[PDB]
Short mmCIF file of C-alpha atoms and ligand atoms in Angstrom, two decimals:
data_model
loop_
_atom_site.label_atom_id
_atom_site.label_comp_id
_atom_site.label_asym_id
_atom_site.label_seq_id
_atom_site.Cartn_x
_atom_site.Cartn_y
_atom_site.Cartn_z
CA UNK A 1 121.13 77.07 118.40
CA UNK A 2 119.59 73.69 117.58
CA UNK A 3 115.91 74.74 117.73
CA UNK A 4 116.56 77.40 115.09
CA UNK A 5 118.17 74.64 112.98
CA UNK A 6 115.14 72.32 113.44
CA UNK A 7 112.67 75.10 112.58
CA UNK A 8 114.61 76.36 109.53
CA UNK A 9 115.81 73.08 107.88
CA UNK A 10 113.73 71.72 104.99
CA UNK A 11 113.62 68.93 102.43
CA UNK A 12 115.45 70.30 99.39
CA UNK A 13 113.63 69.79 96.08
CA UNK A 14 116.47 70.96 93.79
CA UNK A 15 120.25 71.25 94.27
CA UNK A 16 122.91 73.55 92.79
CA UNK A 17 125.34 71.14 91.09
CA UNK A 18 128.22 73.68 91.17
CA UNK A 19 128.19 73.96 95.00
CA UNK A 20 130.32 71.15 96.49
CA UNK A 21 130.92 70.21 100.11
CA UNK A 22 134.27 71.48 101.35
CA UNK A 23 136.89 68.76 102.11
CA UNK A 24 136.20 69.30 105.85
CA UNK A 25 132.41 68.99 105.39
CA UNK A 26 132.90 65.76 103.41
CA UNK A 27 134.78 64.38 106.43
CA UNK A 28 132.17 65.67 108.92
CA UNK A 29 129.25 63.93 107.20
CA UNK A 30 131.15 60.61 107.48
CA UNK A 31 131.70 61.28 111.19
CA UNK A 32 127.95 61.79 111.65
CA UNK A 33 127.18 58.45 109.94
CA UNK A 34 129.72 56.58 112.04
CA UNK A 35 128.87 58.02 115.50
CA UNK A 36 125.06 57.61 115.47
CA UNK A 37 123.80 55.57 118.47
CA UNK A 38 122.05 52.21 117.96
CA UNK A 39 120.46 49.54 120.16
CA UNK A 40 123.22 47.54 121.90
CA UNK A 41 125.69 49.57 119.77
CA UNK A 42 124.82 46.93 117.15
CA UNK A 43 125.56 49.40 114.30
CA UNK A 44 123.69 47.18 111.78
CA UNK A 45 124.49 49.34 108.79
CA UNK A 46 126.56 50.16 105.71
CA UNK A 47 126.82 53.54 103.98
CA UNK A 48 127.57 54.24 100.33
CA UNK A 49 128.78 57.83 99.92
CA UNK A 50 128.69 58.88 96.25
CA UNK A 51 130.63 62.06 95.41
CA UNK A 52 131.79 61.43 91.82
CA UNK A 53 129.58 61.93 88.76
CA UNK A 54 129.99 58.20 87.94
CA UNK A 55 129.07 57.19 91.51
CA UNK A 56 125.98 59.41 91.67
CA UNK A 57 124.83 58.14 88.25
CA UNK A 58 125.00 54.53 89.64
CA UNK A 59 122.77 55.53 92.61
CA UNK A 60 120.43 57.40 90.24
CA UNK A 61 119.71 54.16 88.31
CA UNK A 62 117.37 53.36 91.24
CA UNK A 63 115.20 56.37 90.33
CA UNK A 64 114.69 55.45 86.61
CA UNK A 65 111.14 54.78 85.39
CA UNK A 66 108.62 55.20 88.25
CA UNK A 67 110.85 57.28 90.61
CA UNK A 68 112.15 59.65 87.87
CA UNK A 69 111.43 62.80 89.95
CA UNK A 70 114.14 61.64 92.41
CA UNK A 71 116.90 61.44 89.75
CA UNK A 72 117.85 65.16 89.51
CA UNK A 73 118.16 65.34 93.35
CA UNK A 74 120.56 62.37 93.31
CA UNK A 75 122.60 63.73 90.38
CA UNK A 76 122.82 67.45 91.31
CA UNK A 77 123.69 67.17 95.01
CA UNK A 78 127.37 67.28 96.01
CA UNK A 79 127.28 64.04 98.03
CA UNK A 80 124.68 61.28 98.09
CA UNK A 81 124.46 58.85 101.00
CA UNK A 82 122.79 55.45 100.65
CA UNK A 83 121.76 54.13 104.06
CA UNK A 84 121.76 50.31 104.14
CA UNK A 85 120.73 47.80 106.82
CA UNK A 86 122.12 44.33 107.46
CA UNK A 87 119.75 41.59 106.30
CA UNK A 88 120.74 39.28 109.23
CA UNK A 89 122.54 39.84 112.55
CA UNK A 90 125.35 37.25 112.35
CA UNK A 91 127.79 36.07 115.05
CA UNK A 92 130.76 37.57 113.16
CA UNK A 93 129.19 41.05 113.46
CA UNK A 94 128.34 40.56 117.14
CA UNK A 95 131.98 39.62 117.80
CA UNK A 96 133.22 42.58 115.73
CA UNK A 97 131.19 45.04 117.84
CA UNK A 98 132.22 43.71 121.27
CA UNK A 99 135.88 43.34 120.22
CA UNK A 100 135.85 46.99 119.04
CA UNK A 101 134.34 48.14 122.36
CA UNK A 102 137.14 46.17 124.08
CA UNK A 103 139.84 47.75 121.86
CA UNK A 104 138.39 51.20 122.71
CA UNK A 105 138.79 50.44 126.45
CA UNK A 106 135.11 50.13 127.51
CA UNK A 107 135.67 46.96 129.63
CA UNK A 108 137.58 46.84 132.92
CA UNK A 109 137.67 43.01 132.99
CA UNK A 110 137.06 39.91 130.78
CA UNK A 111 133.86 39.33 132.84
CA UNK A 112 132.50 42.77 131.90
CA UNK A 113 133.24 42.05 128.21
CA UNK A 114 131.53 38.64 128.42
CA UNK A 115 128.47 40.25 130.09
CA UNK A 116 128.24 42.89 127.31
CA UNK A 117 128.42 40.18 124.63
CA UNK A 118 125.80 38.05 126.46
CA UNK A 119 123.38 41.00 126.73
CA UNK A 120 123.77 41.89 123.01
CA UNK A 121 123.21 38.23 121.98
CA UNK A 122 120.13 38.03 124.26
CA UNK A 123 118.58 41.05 122.52
CA UNK A 124 119.59 39.89 119.03
CA UNK A 125 118.22 36.35 119.65
CA UNK A 126 114.93 37.79 120.98
CA UNK A 127 114.38 39.64 117.69
CA UNK A 128 115.42 36.69 115.39
CA UNK A 129 113.90 33.74 117.34
CA UNK A 130 110.85 35.10 119.22
CA UNK A 131 109.68 38.38 117.67
CA UNK A 132 110.67 37.33 114.11
CA UNK A 133 111.49 40.97 113.39
CA UNK A 134 115.32 41.12 113.27
CA UNK A 135 115.40 42.65 109.76
CA UNK A 136 112.89 45.31 110.92
CA UNK A 137 114.78 45.90 114.19
CA UNK A 138 117.99 46.59 112.26
CA UNK A 139 116.20 48.80 109.72
CA UNK A 140 114.84 50.86 112.63
CA UNK A 141 118.40 51.58 113.84
CA UNK A 142 119.28 52.74 110.33
CA UNK A 143 116.25 55.14 110.32
CA UNK A 144 117.48 56.44 113.70
CA UNK A 145 120.86 57.13 112.05
CA UNK A 146 119.03 58.96 109.22
CA UNK A 147 117.25 61.21 111.76
CA UNK A 148 120.54 62.04 113.47
CA UNK A 149 122.14 62.71 110.05
CA UNK A 150 119.42 65.08 108.75
CA UNK A 151 119.63 67.32 111.82
CA UNK A 152 123.44 67.08 111.81
CA UNK A 153 123.84 68.15 108.19
CA UNK A 154 121.36 71.06 108.68
CA UNK A 155 123.44 72.20 111.67
CA UNK A 156 126.52 72.16 109.38
CA UNK A 157 124.70 74.61 107.08
CA UNK A 158 124.08 71.95 104.42
CA UNK A 159 120.91 71.21 102.50
CA UNK A 160 119.57 67.68 102.18
CA UNK A 161 116.52 65.58 101.38
CA UNK A 162 115.70 62.06 102.66
CA UNK A 163 114.38 59.81 99.86
CA UNK A 164 112.22 56.67 100.11
CA UNK A 165 111.25 57.35 96.47
CA UNK A 166 113.68 54.95 94.78
CA UNK A 167 113.70 51.29 93.74
CA UNK A 168 115.66 49.40 96.41
CA UNK A 169 115.84 46.21 94.28
CA UNK A 170 117.57 48.17 91.50
CA UNK A 171 119.93 49.90 93.96
CA UNK A 172 120.73 46.62 95.76
CA UNK A 173 121.53 44.95 92.42
CA UNK A 174 123.66 47.89 91.20
CA UNK A 175 125.98 47.64 94.23
CA UNK A 176 125.55 43.87 94.79
CA UNK A 177 124.30 44.48 98.33
CA UNK A 178 122.28 41.26 98.77
CA UNK A 179 125.36 39.04 98.41
CA UNK A 180 127.29 41.32 100.80
CA UNK A 181 124.45 41.00 103.36
CA UNK A 182 122.80 44.48 103.14
CA UNK A 183 119.71 46.20 101.70
CA UNK A 184 119.21 49.88 100.80
CA UNK A 185 116.59 51.84 102.79
CA UNK A 186 116.98 55.63 102.36
CA UNK A 187 118.98 57.81 99.96
CA UNK A 188 120.05 61.24 101.24
CA UNK A 189 121.48 63.77 98.74
CA UNK A 190 123.47 66.50 100.54
CA UNK A 191 124.64 69.85 99.16
CA UNK A 192 123.19 73.33 98.57
CA UNK A 193 119.73 74.18 97.22
CA UNK A 194 119.20 76.03 93.92
CA UNK A 195 116.77 78.87 93.14
CA UNK A 196 114.50 76.08 91.74
CA UNK A 197 114.01 74.61 95.23
CA UNK A 198 110.35 75.65 95.70
CA UNK A 199 110.34 74.14 99.22
CA UNK A 200 113.02 76.54 100.53
CA UNK A 201 110.54 79.43 100.79
CA UNK A 202 107.38 77.58 101.91
CA UNK A 203 106.20 77.57 105.57
CA UNK A 204 106.89 74.37 107.54
CA UNK A 205 103.79 72.38 108.47
CA UNK A 206 103.30 70.04 111.45
CA UNK A 207 100.28 68.76 113.33
CA UNK A 208 99.66 70.69 116.59
CA UNK A 209 100.94 69.25 119.89
CA UNK A 210 97.34 69.05 121.22
CA UNK A 211 96.91 66.10 118.80
CA UNK A 212 100.32 64.41 118.99
CA UNK A 213 101.50 65.03 122.56
CA UNK A 214 100.19 64.05 126.01
CA UNK A 215 101.75 65.48 129.18
CA UNK A 216 101.53 63.51 132.45
CA UNK B 1 129.42 72.89 116.65
CA UNK B 2 127.26 69.85 115.88
CA UNK B 3 130.19 67.43 115.33
CA UNK B 4 131.47 68.17 118.84
CA UNK B 5 127.94 67.43 120.09
CA UNK B 6 127.76 64.09 118.20
CA UNK B 7 131.22 63.01 119.42
CA UNK B 8 130.59 64.03 123.07
CA UNK B 9 126.96 62.89 123.68
CA UNK B 10 126.45 59.53 125.39
CA UNK B 11 123.76 57.19 126.69
CA UNK B 12 123.29 58.20 130.34
CA UNK B 13 123.24 55.32 132.82
CA UNK B 14 122.23 57.33 135.91
CA UNK B 15 120.44 60.66 136.32
CA UNK B 16 120.53 63.33 139.02
CA UNK B 17 116.88 63.61 140.15
CA UNK B 18 117.41 67.15 141.56
CA UNK B 19 118.50 68.59 138.18
CA UNK B 20 115.37 69.55 136.22
CA UNK B 21 114.91 70.88 132.70
CA UNK B 22 114.40 74.64 132.70
CA UNK B 23 110.86 75.77 131.69
CA UNK B 24 112.23 76.83 128.26
CA UNK B 25 114.04 73.48 127.78
CA UNK B 26 110.81 71.60 128.59
CA UNK B 27 109.17 73.53 125.72
CA UNK B 28 112.15 73.05 123.37
CA UNK B 29 112.12 69.25 123.69
CA UNK B 30 108.44 69.27 122.64
CA UNK B 31 109.35 71.42 119.62
CA UNK B 32 112.00 68.85 118.61
CA UNK B 33 109.41 66.02 118.79
CA UNK B 34 106.91 67.98 116.70
CA UNK B 35 109.27 69.26 113.94
CA UNK B 36 111.02 65.97 113.04
CA UNK B 37 110.64 65.14 109.31
CA UNK B 38 108.79 61.99 108.19
CA UNK B 39 107.95 60.33 104.86
CA UNK B 40 105.16 62.33 103.17
CA UNK B 41 105.00 64.44 106.36
CA UNK B 42 102.85 61.53 107.58
CA UNK B 43 103.85 62.19 111.23
CA UNK B 44 102.55 58.74 112.32
CA UNK B 45 103.30 59.27 115.98
CA UNK B 46 102.21 60.18 119.50
CA UNK B 47 104.45 61.27 122.38
CA UNK B 48 103.85 60.90 126.12
CA UNK B 49 105.95 63.40 128.09
CA UNK B 50 106.14 62.45 131.78
CA UNK B 51 107.49 65.15 134.12
CA UNK B 52 105.64 64.48 137.42
CA UNK B 53 106.51 61.80 139.98
CA UNK B 54 103.12 60.14 139.32
CA UNK B 55 103.61 60.25 135.53
CA UNK B 56 107.14 58.82 135.63
CA UNK B 57 106.04 56.05 138.03
CA UNK B 58 103.35 55.02 135.46
CA UNK B 59 106.01 54.80 132.69
CA UNK B 60 108.36 52.95 135.07
CA UNK B 61 105.83 50.07 135.42
CA UNK B 62 107.23 48.98 132.03
CA UNK B 63 110.68 48.35 133.57
CA UNK B 64 109.41 45.11 135.19
CA UNK B 65 111.10 41.70 134.95
CA UNK B 66 113.99 41.52 132.47
CA UNK B 67 113.97 45.36 132.22
CA UNK B 68 114.64 46.27 135.91
CA UNK B 69 117.84 48.20 134.98
CA UNK B 70 115.65 50.69 133.12
CA UNK B 71 113.64 51.62 136.26
CA UNK B 72 116.08 54.12 137.90
CA UNK B 73 116.64 55.88 134.53
CA UNK B 74 112.89 56.37 134.06
CA UNK B 75 112.32 57.55 137.64
CA UNK B 76 115.35 59.83 138.17
CA UNK B 77 115.38 61.78 134.87
CA UNK B 78 113.64 65.17 134.77
CA UNK B 79 111.46 64.36 131.75
CA UNK B 80 110.67 61.00 130.16
CA UNK B 81 109.44 60.77 126.57
CA UNK B 82 107.54 57.73 125.29
CA UNK B 83 107.73 57.53 121.50
CA UNK B 84 104.67 55.80 120.00
CA UNK B 85 103.71 54.79 116.46
CA UNK B 86 100.23 54.52 114.98
CA UNK B 87 99.09 50.91 114.64
CA UNK B 88 97.37 51.57 111.27
CA UNK B 89 97.45 54.46 108.75
CA UNK B 90 93.80 55.57 108.40
CA UNK B 91 92.23 58.03 105.92
CA UNK B 92 91.26 60.39 108.76
CA UNK B 93 94.97 60.87 109.59
CA UNK B 94 95.91 61.41 105.94
CA UNK B 95 93.20 64.10 105.70
CA UNK B 96 94.38 65.69 108.96
CA UNK B 97 97.93 66.04 107.59
CA UNK B 98 96.98 67.59 104.21
CA UNK B 99 94.42 69.92 105.83
CA UNK B 100 97.14 71.13 108.24
CA UNK B 101 99.57 71.73 105.34
CA UNK B 102 96.77 73.77 103.73
CA UNK B 103 96.14 75.77 106.93
CA UNK B 104 99.91 76.48 107.10
CA UNK B 105 99.78 77.95 103.57
CA UNK B 106 101.76 75.30 101.61
CA UNK B 107 99.26 75.17 98.69
CA UNK B 108 98.68 78.04 96.26
CA UNK B 109 95.65 76.34 94.65
CA UNK B 110 93.06 73.56 95.26
CA UNK B 111 94.84 71.58 92.49
CA UNK B 112 98.16 71.69 94.39
CA UNK B 113 96.40 70.46 97.55
CA UNK B 114 94.69 67.62 95.65
CA UNK B 115 98.03 66.60 94.08
CA UNK B 116 99.72 66.50 97.53
CA UNK B 117 96.89 64.33 98.90
CA UNK B 118 97.09 62.00 95.86
CA UNK B 119 100.86 61.56 96.24
CA UNK B 120 100.55 60.83 100.02
CA UNK B 121 97.75 58.29 99.39
CA UNK B 122 99.81 56.59 96.67
CA UNK B 123 102.72 56.05 99.08
CA UNK B 124 100.45 55.15 102.02
CA UNK B 125 98.44 52.68 99.89
CA UNK B 126 101.63 51.01 98.67
CA UNK B 127 102.51 50.18 102.29
CA UNK B 128 98.98 49.31 103.61
CA UNK B 129 97.43 47.65 100.49
CA UNK B 130 100.39 46.04 98.63
CA UNK B 131 103.40 45.50 100.93
CA UNK B 132 101.25 45.07 104.08
CA UNK B 133 104.06 46.74 106.02
CA UNK B 134 102.42 50.03 107.09
CA UNK B 135 103.02 49.27 110.80
CA UNK B 136 106.76 48.83 110.09
CA UNK B 137 106.85 51.86 107.78
CA UNK B 138 105.33 54.08 110.48
CA UNK B 139 107.63 52.69 113.20
CA UNK B 140 110.61 53.58 110.99
CA UNK B 141 109.47 57.24 110.92
CA UNK B 142 109.24 57.18 114.72
CA UNK B 143 112.85 55.84 114.99
CA UNK B 144 113.91 58.68 112.64
CA UNK B 145 112.26 61.11 115.08
CA UNK B 146 114.18 59.44 117.97
CA UNK B 147 117.47 59.99 116.07
CA UNK B 148 116.67 63.66 115.52
CA UNK B 149 115.64 64.00 119.19
CA UNK B 150 118.79 62.42 120.69
CA UNK B 151 121.11 64.76 118.78
CA UNK B 152 118.78 67.72 119.43
CA UNK B 153 118.64 67.24 123.20
CA UNK B 154 122.44 66.83 123.36
CA UNK B 155 122.79 70.11 121.45
CA UNK B 156 120.56 71.72 124.14
CA UNK B 157 123.09 70.56 126.75
CA UNK B 158 120.83 67.80 128.09
CA UNK B 159 121.62 64.19 128.89
CA UNK B 160 119.44 61.35 127.65
CA UNK B 161 119.30 57.63 127.04
CA UNK B 162 117.21 55.80 124.39
CA UNK B 163 115.59 52.65 125.83
CA UNK B 164 114.27 49.58 123.97
CA UNK B 165 114.65 47.74 127.30
CA UNK B 166 111.06 48.08 128.52
CA UNK B 167 107.84 46.07 128.33
CA UNK B 168 105.73 47.67 125.59
CA UNK B 169 102.65 45.57 126.51
CA UNK B 170 102.77 46.94 130.07
CA UNK B 171 103.32 50.51 128.85
CA UNK B 172 100.56 50.26 126.21
CA UNK B 173 98.12 48.93 128.84
CA UNK B 174 99.05 51.58 131.42
CA UNK B 175 98.21 54.43 129.04
CA UNK B 176 95.49 52.60 127.07
CA UNK B 177 97.40 53.15 123.83
CA UNK B 178 95.97 50.20 121.86
CA UNK B 179 92.41 51.57 122.02
CA UNK B 180 93.71 55.05 121.03
CA UNK B 181 95.47 53.47 118.02
CA UNK B 182 99.16 53.65 119.10
CA UNK B 183 101.95 51.40 120.41
CA UNK B 184 105.05 52.34 122.43
CA UNK B 185 108.45 51.83 120.74
CA UNK B 186 111.23 53.74 122.57
CA UNK B 187 111.42 55.49 125.95
CA UNK B 188 113.84 58.41 126.29
CA UNK B 189 114.57 59.78 129.80
CA UNK B 190 116.01 63.32 129.54
CA UNK B 191 117.80 65.34 132.21
CA UNK B 192 121.28 65.57 133.70
CA UNK B 193 123.64 62.70 134.52
CA UNK B 194 124.82 62.00 138.07
CA UNK B 195 128.37 61.18 139.26
CA UNK B 196 127.13 57.52 139.20
CA UNK B 197 126.80 57.60 135.39
CA UNK B 198 129.71 55.24 134.58
CA UNK B 199 129.15 55.80 130.83
CA UNK B 200 129.89 59.56 131.05
CA UNK B 201 133.64 58.92 131.45
CA UNK B 202 134.09 55.89 129.14
CA UNK B 203 135.45 56.23 125.57
CA UNK B 204 132.87 56.14 122.76
CA UNK B 205 133.24 53.07 120.53
CA UNK B 206 132.24 52.61 116.87
CA UNK B 207 133.26 50.24 114.09
CA UNK B 208 135.86 51.78 111.73
CA UNK B 209 134.69 53.35 108.44
CA UNK B 210 136.81 50.83 106.49
CA UNK B 211 134.11 48.27 107.46
CA UNK B 212 130.92 50.37 107.37
CA UNK B 213 131.51 52.96 104.63
CA UNK B 214 132.15 52.68 100.89
CA UNK B 215 133.07 55.76 98.84
CA UNK B 216 132.17 55.85 95.12
C1 FMN C 1 117.03 52.17 119.91
C2 FMN C 1 117.98 52.15 121.07
C3 FMN C 1 117.66 51.46 122.22
C4 FMN C 1 118.51 51.46 123.34
N1 FMN C 1 118.09 50.80 124.47
C5 FMN C 1 118.86 50.88 125.54
C6 FMN C 1 118.41 50.30 126.75
O1 FMN C 1 117.34 49.73 126.86
N2 FMN C 1 119.21 50.45 127.86
C7 FMN C 1 120.41 51.08 127.80
O2 FMN C 1 121.06 51.15 128.85
N3 FMN C 1 120.90 51.59 126.65
C8 FMN C 1 120.14 51.53 125.57
N4 FMN C 1 120.59 52.10 124.38
C9 FMN C 1 121.89 52.79 124.35
C10 FMN C 1 122.91 52.10 123.45
O3 FMN C 1 123.53 51.02 124.15
C11 FMN C 1 123.97 53.11 122.98
O4 FMN C 1 123.32 54.04 122.12
C12 FMN C 1 125.18 52.55 122.23
O5 FMN C 1 125.92 51.69 123.11
C13 FMN C 1 126.09 53.66 121.74
O6 FMN C 1 126.57 54.43 122.87
P1 FMN C 1 126.24 56.02 122.99
O7 FMN C 1 124.72 56.17 122.89
O8 FMN C 1 126.77 56.41 124.35
O9 FMN C 1 126.98 56.70 121.85
C14 FMN C 1 119.76 52.11 123.26
C15 FMN C 1 120.11 52.74 122.06
C16 FMN C 1 119.24 52.81 120.99
C17 FMN C 1 119.64 53.55 119.74
C1 FMN C 2 111.85 58.56 105.36
C2 FMN C 2 111.57 59.76 104.49
C3 FMN C 2 111.45 59.62 103.13
C4 FMN C 2 111.22 60.73 102.29
N1 FMN C 2 111.16 60.52 100.94
C5 FMN C 2 111.01 61.58 100.17
C6 FMN C 2 111.01 61.40 98.77
O1 FMN C 2 111.17 60.30 98.25
N2 FMN C 2 110.88 62.52 97.98
C7 FMN C 2 110.72 63.76 98.52
O2 FMN C 2 110.61 64.70 97.73
N3 FMN C 2 110.68 63.96 99.86
C8 FMN C 2 110.83 62.93 100.65
N4 FMN C 2 110.83 63.10 102.03
C9 FMN C 2 110.67 64.46 102.59
C10 FMN C 2 109.36 64.66 103.35
O3 FMN C 2 108.28 64.95 102.46
C11 FMN C 2 109.52 65.79 104.37
O4 FMN C 2 110.47 65.39 105.36
C12 FMN C 2 108.24 66.22 105.10
O5 FMN C 2 107.27 66.68 104.15
C13 FMN C 2 108.49 67.31 106.11
O6 FMN C 2 109.08 68.47 105.45
P1 FMN C 2 110.57 68.94 105.85
O7 FMN C 2 111.47 67.73 105.70
O8 FMN C 2 110.91 70.03 104.84
O9 FMN C 2 110.51 69.48 107.27
C14 FMN C 2 111.06 62.01 102.87
C15 FMN C 2 111.13 62.13 104.27
C16 FMN C 2 111.41 61.04 105.07
C17 FMN C 2 111.52 61.23 106.56
O1 NIO C 3 121.76 49.05 124.23
C1 NIO C 3 121.41 48.52 125.30
O2 NIO C 3 122.07 48.55 126.35
C2 NIO C 3 120.09 47.79 125.31
C3 NIO C 3 119.28 47.74 124.18
C4 NIO C 3 118.08 47.06 124.24
C5 NIO C 3 117.72 46.46 125.43
N1 NIO C 3 118.47 46.49 126.53
C6 NIO C 3 119.64 47.16 126.46
O1 NIO C 4 107.61 62.68 101.24
C1 NIO C 4 107.57 62.51 100.01
O2 NIO C 4 107.43 63.43 99.18
C2 NIO C 4 107.70 61.11 99.49
C3 NIO C 4 107.83 60.03 100.35
C4 NIO C 4 107.94 58.76 99.83
C5 NIO C 4 107.92 58.60 98.46
N1 NIO C 4 107.80 59.62 97.61
C6 NIO C 4 107.69 60.85 98.13
#
């Protein structure tokens, strides 16, 4: 049951390098990334999934120097996911999304398709022209994906840790993301915790609902 | 089976007003809100849970103007959750979080507690003093919570729809959020879909992994 999952999941502080995702699990984590919801189904994201030693080493370059504590997590986990946001919402992407919805049979008529496209452009233009927050808006959808992913992987019986503790400039440069139109936001190592994971045995802590939650 | 949940969940376009959350479900959705992870366990959020006719009507004020299509969703769902972010990360909140971790037994020594506080302040100060993006940083954690919540509620067998299509100024004013130190970001009606939910029967559409996903 999902509440048990939410109450028992934790941020893993150390991974067992010998314990790999099964082939099926490796496919399932990709499914989770793909099928996250997003505003206007804008899907303003790219994922780097590192599963080779070479690949994980490249991601771990972002943790060198000041973020060194993050390196072992990135190197010892089975699979490491880099969540990236688009840096601009371009017309090519908008067309890609609506054309895909059309290919998947979501529109009964050309008018319905046109209306969907118009609505998505309205929202996108509002963020870029009026709110001046389009980069932030897209990054928010990526964080939503991350939240979906963390619960999803826990429910698959996998350990994980979300990481903001890395140098995004280094990671962006390593994978040439800027030129491709993306920027790295969160790194999520996924695998199985080791006996050295001190956080596996500690009680969860959250503020009480009397502070955070109002019922009306 | 969480993958089945992810593949089958959808954004509900119309709710059956007669179909209420069970008492236990109403508690479980609150648990999901509370137990979401966040960077440094900063939990920079407040939730309004509207379950009365009066309460939902107050939220539905925000579906004015361009956002009229959101009104029925907000009024007809069993429970409506307003996800809010803090407007600034203050020292009182940082102390609240570490003191709660201490009360929950996460620190073996005063030194461990002090180290946790120091680490949290380092990260928080980076955002508020250097990047001047603490508002954005906090809003990102809230969107992560939303992602967790949407999958969680689906796994409970509940329908939902995330909504950016509302007037945050109207909502903030209605609940006096600004003065309390919060701002509304996403509204999530939760309940059961009606036969009028045209999105319940439509195929789900996502961009292919050959565009969005790189394996290394
Ligand atoms: C942050 C966010 C905001 C959304 N806002 C709205 C909204 O205002 N109205 C609406 O009908 N759908 C809204 N949606 C639903 C999206 O259109 C939907 O998630 C997307 O088309 C993918 O479809 P699915 O959720 O059925 O998988 C929102 C989704 C997200 C993630
Ligand atoms: C966006 C985000 C970034 C995080 N970055 C790190 C990190 O860099 N290093 C780390 O050890 N934990 C990191 N965490 C884990 C949090 O400390 C953790 O989620 C929080 O303390 C709650 O504990 P739990 O995840 O075990 O429930 C991050 C969490 C989130 C949501
Ligand atoms: O996804 C949608 O349908 C949507 C998102 C934002 C605002 N209005 C609609
Ligand atoms: O939650 C953490 O431990 C954390 C968050 C951001 C950066 N470094 C650590």
